[PDB]
Design a protein around this ligand. Structure first.
Ligand SMILES: COc1cc(Nc2ncc(-c3ccccc3CN(C)C(=O)CN)o2)ccc1-c1cnco1
Ligand SMILES: *[C@H]1O[C@H](CO)[C@@H](O)[C@H](O)[C@H]1O
Ligand SMILES: *[C@@H]1O[C@@H](C)[C@@H](O)[C@@H](O)[C@@H]1O
Ligand SMILES: [Ca+2]
Ligand SMILES: [Ca+2]
Ligand SMILES: [Cl-]
Ligand SMILES: [Cl-]
Ligand SMILES: [Mg+2]
Lengths: 254, 196, 141
């Protein structure tokens, strides 16, 4: 996260740290005791599918305390339409081998209904993005969980307020813009998969997922997030389905 | 199947504020949203077939805030158009004033200007133009005796003028509301003429 | 009546009580600027005579327009919009705290996410679990 602050311990309780072979991979969001939502591009170069770990209650990567819980990832589910190395359909649904225990430090983020998300949550101006990703583009990562407040834009406004500099892939109906074009505040590489959480009438909900991070806070560009409301039905169906032998499952979308 | 609204215009006087736009809808309805640059969007005039939307209740919550509105076109992301920014306190037209009364005390005349009601409310009652603007609002009096060639002018920080007149002569008056700190739209239309 | 024309010039007799045209008022005022000042408000007419303010609203005349002051439950240029007829899920979530369900014929109904139940007021939600989703326990949930 560039331009953010440290999330005070326990104040982003749904944040997940994904590790592969003990190394920091991506972010994620706990939506219940068993399921975690992350980004599909996070798993592009994974070879050791049995070495995936999700960590809940993490705050400081340099110190272990009694609040951290670890679980093996039993299944990564990605939409079939997703094409590795690209931006569209950047969502993954993870099944934990054993459930986490909900504590003052480990709490899931509400996955909302599609309609509430489309006509109500979409019009809440600011939402929070978080992670242990780079503190500057190409810079070093954060040791403590960082958080940043970002304003949402409708894609028409986003394209009219952007400059077609560097990599400018299309912003589809499965994406949404949020942030600033003045190069001061954005989510970066390492924050991918983390939540974009929206506060409404006393409760927080999952609205977006941090997508590709490389090139973050480029002047003339906004942040682009996976539009979670488009995948509600898909996520709810897969959450009701039984496990498959392999870790990776490319499930049909829609 | 739909067309994006165009020529979005603010029509505002004494804080009665209406957004207007083209064109008339054929097999399409409209929805308006309004916001401050950091607040959430509020929906108004839901699935309307009118080409106007009264946004008075939203803009009177803070008349010094800057607002942005947008008009959505749905068939009977959607097509939408942004309005120009609007700051009520700086852009609302000053309504036409009315002379409430005039009284003579020999060689002096008191001219009282009626309190101009605005659409701004403060618990049960409507605030006047002076309640909202205070020190920023002045009234100007244009007066003249019927036998002279030119007119004279008096200015007030309240709603009353106390002027010197000539003995045994009939004078005619007209008042204008002014916000001197403005460069654009700084005056109301003149009140109807009143003579003794 | 020609015998009424014997009477000398008067703004009250000729223009207030009777009507009067631009030349009649110009003969009284003499100056152009003075007559124009009177005529702009005089020839404008009362836009409020058609009683355009509905639902008990109050009309205030302007130059070639008017303003309606509505009672608290109404809005619109002419106070035509009843604020009570706006209880739909797209209007501030129907007053619901969490979910809103639009119902044709009957009114809308509020609902809650799992781990919450609907309160008596029909719009608020209360947690039915120790750790409901989307609440931060260290800030007293
Ligand atoms: C089609 O025209 C555009 C498209 C874009 N597209 C875009 N901007 C950013 C991205 C993106 C897409 C997915 C994932 C991550 C990111 C950017 N990124 C590194 C982040 O969001 C880190 N948080 O795509 C930008 C500008 C234009 C443009 C300018 N004038 C006209 O059109
Ligand atoms: C009174 O009549 C109509 C409303 O009924 C309005 O459009 C006019 O402007 C007003 O004079
Ligand atoms: C004018 O104002 C409206 C709001 C109502 O109170 C009317 O009764 C009054 O004449
Ligand atoms: Ca730790
Ligand atoms: Ca008039
Ligand atoms: Cl486990
Ligand atoms: Cl006043
Ligand atoms: Mg005559």
């Amino acid at each position: 996260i560039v331009g953010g602050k440290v999330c005070p311990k326990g104040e982003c309780p749904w944040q997940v740290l994904l590790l592969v072979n003990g190394a920091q991979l991506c972010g994620g969001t706990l939506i219940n005791t068993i399921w975690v939502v992350s980004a599909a591009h996070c798993f592009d170069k994974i070879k050791n599918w049995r070495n995936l770990i999700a960590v809940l209650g993490e705050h400081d990567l340099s110190e272990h305390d009694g609040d951290e819980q670890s679980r093996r990832v039993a299944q990564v589910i990605i939409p079939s339409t997703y094409v590795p190395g690209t931006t569209n359909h950047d969502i993954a649904l993870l099944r934990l081998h054993q459930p986490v225990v909900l504590t003052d430090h480990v709490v899931p983020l509400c996955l909302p209904e599609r309609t509430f998300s489309e006509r109500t949550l979409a019009f809440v101006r600011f939402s929070l993005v978080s992670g242990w990703g780079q503190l500057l583009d190409r810079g070093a990562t954060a040791l403590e969980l960082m958080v940043l407040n970002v304003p949402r834009l409708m894609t028409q406004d986003c394209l009219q307020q952007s400059r077609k500099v560097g990599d400018s892939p299309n912003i589809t109906e499965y994406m949404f813009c949020a942030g600033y074009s003045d190069g001061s505040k954005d989510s970066c590489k390492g924050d991918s998969g983390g939540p974009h959480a929206t506060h409404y009438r006393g409760t927080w909900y999952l609205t977006g997922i941090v997508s590709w991070g490389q090139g973050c806070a480029t002047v003339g560009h906004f942040g682009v997030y996976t539009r979670v409301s488009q995948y509600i039905e898909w996520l709810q169906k897969l959450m009701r389905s039984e496990p498959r032998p392999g870790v990776l499952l490319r499930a049909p979308f829609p | 199947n739909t067309v994006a609204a165009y020529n979005l215009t603010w029509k505002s006087t004494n804080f009665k504020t209406i957004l207007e736009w083209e064109p008339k809808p054929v097999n399409q309805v409209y929805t308006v949203q309004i916001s401050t640059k950091s607040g959430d969007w509020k929906s108004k005039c839901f699935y309307t077939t009118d080409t106007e939307c009264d946004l008075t209740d939203e803009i009177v919550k803070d008349v010094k805030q800057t607002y942005l509105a947008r008009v959505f076109s749905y068939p009977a992301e959607p097509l939408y158009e942004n309005s120009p920014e609007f700051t009520p306190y700086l852009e609302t037209n000053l309504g036409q004033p009315t002379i409430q009364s005039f009284e003579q005390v020999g060689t002096k005349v008191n001219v009282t200007v009626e309190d101009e009601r605005t659409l701004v409310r403060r618990n049960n009652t409507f605030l006047s133009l002076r309640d909202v603007f205070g020190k920023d609002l002045i009234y100007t009096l244009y007066y003249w005796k019927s036998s002279s060639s030119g007119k004279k002018t008096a200015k007030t920080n309240t709603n009353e003028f106390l002027i010197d007149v000539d003995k045994g002569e009939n004078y005619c008056f007209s008042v204008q509301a002014v916000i001197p700190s403005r460069t654009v739209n700084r005056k109301s239309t003149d009140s109807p003429v009143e003579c003794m | 009546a020609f015998l009424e024309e014997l009477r000398p010039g008067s703004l009250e007799r000729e223009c207030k009580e009777e009507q009067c045209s631009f030349e009649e008022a110009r003969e009284i005022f003499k100056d152009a600027e003075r007559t124009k000042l009177f005529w702009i408000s005089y020839s404008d007419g009362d836009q409020c005579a058609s009683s355009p303010c509905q639902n008990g609203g109050s009309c205030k005349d302007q130059l070639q327009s008017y303003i309606c002051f509505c009672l608290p439950a109404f809005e619109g240029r002419n106070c035509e919009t009843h604020k009570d007829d706006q209880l739909i899920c797209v209007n501030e979530n129907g007053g619901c705290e969490q979910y809103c369900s639009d119902h044709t014929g009957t009114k809308r109904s509020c609902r809650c996410h799992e781990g919450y139940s609907l309160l008596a007021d029909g719009v608020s939600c209360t947690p039915t679990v120790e750790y409901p989703c989307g609440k931060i326990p260290i800030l007293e949930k």
